[PDB]
Design an enzyme around this catalytic site. Structure first.
Site, PDB file in Angstrom:
ATOM      1  CD  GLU A   1      -3.139   5.893   6.258  1.00  0.00           C
ATOM      2  OE1 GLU A   1      -3.660   5.708   5.266  1.00  0.00           O
ATOM      3  OE2 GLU A   1      -2.661   5.842   6.949  1.00  0.00           O
TER       4      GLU A   1
ATOM      5  CE  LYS B   1      -0.752   3.705   5.152  1.00  0.00           C
ATOM      6  NZ  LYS B   1      -0.564   4.038   6.081  1.00  0.00           N
TER       7      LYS B   1
ATOM      8  CG  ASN C   1      -2.206   0.911   0.974  1.00  0.00           C
ATOM      9  OD1 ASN C   1      -1.742   1.403   0.346  1.00  0.00           O
ATOM     10  ND2 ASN C   1      -2.449   1.222   3.021  1.00  0.00           N
TER      11      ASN C   1
HETATM   12 CA   LIG Z   1      -1.464   0.018   4.882  1.00  0.00          CA
END
Ligand SMILES: [Ca+2]
Ligand SMILES: [Ca+2]
Ligand SMILES: [Ca+2]
Lengths: 244, 244
Positions: free
Chosen positions: A95, A10, A8
């Site tokens: 998140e 992000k 990931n």
């Molecule tokens: Ca993560």
């Protein structure tokens, strides 16, 4: 069971940086039998990944709309991801639960969109520090899991990411990972029966090359959801080694 | 100044469809005097648009992160959009204020990220039916504008979309669009002085080929932000005809 190394990024890497990263991974990637890689990138980097990633490395999104199409400015649908060549997508990352107020039922709905469009949803669950300090991390995370998988079929990946482990450097112990992974598998059996044995359960939260082998070596952990250590190819290569 | 025909697809069109749309538009597009077009698309469609849109047609995003980079799963940054070829981006669309709880201050931060990365923000403001029925549409929209432009530079576009006109078929009258555009320009002069005369102010909400000319012809209206009518190339061509 294929071990799964989910990466990931992000909100990192422009399309130009995604292409360079994937070019670099290409030069250095040697498959490990038993291990799948998946790169979870910003949606506008997917075209670069489809062009430049190695054959057997899957790629996917970091989120997806709860809706099929329509008047949802700024949202991106499961049909769109799929058409871009995604094969998986993260839903309910901490998140997004926190910053974007995603509920369990929203996560279930997003996972259902993924599945309706040939995408493997990676459904994230995990408790905050306060829950963990109360010793209630298992029952709260399983309650969150039931909510998040309501109406979701067996073609799913569950990622346990304790919120206190995300971005903090405070990695869960391998024992603590296996605790939740084992309890999660019990719940999956209740919901899915025998299919539960094939459902991959990941650990995420400050995963690094030096801790990943011991965590994924536990009986009910089937891989990792990796944040920061995914951004640099050498780190990816080290994590892959640890799983060989 | 230039009439701006801003085309907001919202959550519609896969990259394959985006490409087809841009190709069809390439074969049928004949520029209209003083009319600029911009296509506001799902972020993973930008690559298709970059390669296939005809000369002089800008393209951009429908939202942008309030942050530069980092641990914000599923968010897309201004630097990413720029690198993809975007030259503009919608911020604070009513659908995102309502569905994603975006505050004025958040919109202002998004607008500043856009400007820091060479993107033209399109800042949306507009009142709901309740405010309109109290007759307080001007003071409430201007209060929303002040907050959404807090620390935003003069290289901005303001789009007035009354919420009750979005997806409902109930287009504001040209007179009501001009009422807000003229009031908005008065506020822009307080904030930006002489630069206010060059700041483009758009009307949006149920814009069609049949109503766009009378709206855009008003003294303080400098174009339209178009939703549903943007999806079919023939509708784009009719709106274009109406502005010829
Ligand atoms: Ca993560
Ligand atoms: Ca294992
Ligand atoms: Ca619109």
């Amino acid at each position: 069971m294929q071990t799964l190394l989910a990466l990931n990024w992000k909100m990192n890497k422009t399309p130009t940086e995604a292409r360079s990263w994937a070019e670099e991974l290409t030069t250095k990637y040697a498959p490990a039998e038993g291990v799948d890689l998946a790169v979870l990138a910003p949606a506008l980097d997917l075209s670069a990944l489809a062009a430049n990633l190695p054959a057997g490395i899957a790629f996917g999104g970091q989120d997806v709309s709860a809706h099929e199409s329509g008047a949802y400015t700024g949202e991106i649908s499961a049909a769109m991801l799929k058409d871009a060549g995604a094969s998986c997508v993260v839903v309910g990352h901490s998140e997004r639960r926190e910053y974007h107020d995603e509920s369990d039922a929203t996560v279930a709905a997003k996972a259902r969109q993924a599945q309706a469009n040939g995408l493997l949803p990676i459904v994230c669950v995990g408790e905050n520090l306060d829950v963990r300090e109360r010793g209630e991390h298992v029952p709260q995370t399983l309650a969150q899991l039931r909510g998040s998988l309501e109406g979701v079929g067996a073609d799913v990946v569950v990622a346990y990411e304790p919120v206190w482990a995300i971005g903090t450097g405070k990695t869960a112990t391998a024992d603590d990972a296996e605790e939740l992974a084992a309890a999660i598998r019990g719940a999956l059996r209740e919901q899915y029966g025998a299919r539960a044995e094939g459902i991959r359960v990941l650990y995420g939260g400050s995963v690094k090359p030096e801790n990943i082998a011991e965590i994924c070596g536990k009986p009910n952990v089937n891989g990792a959801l990796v944040g920061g250590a995914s951004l640099k190819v050498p780190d990816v290569l080290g994590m892959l080694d640890a799983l060989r």
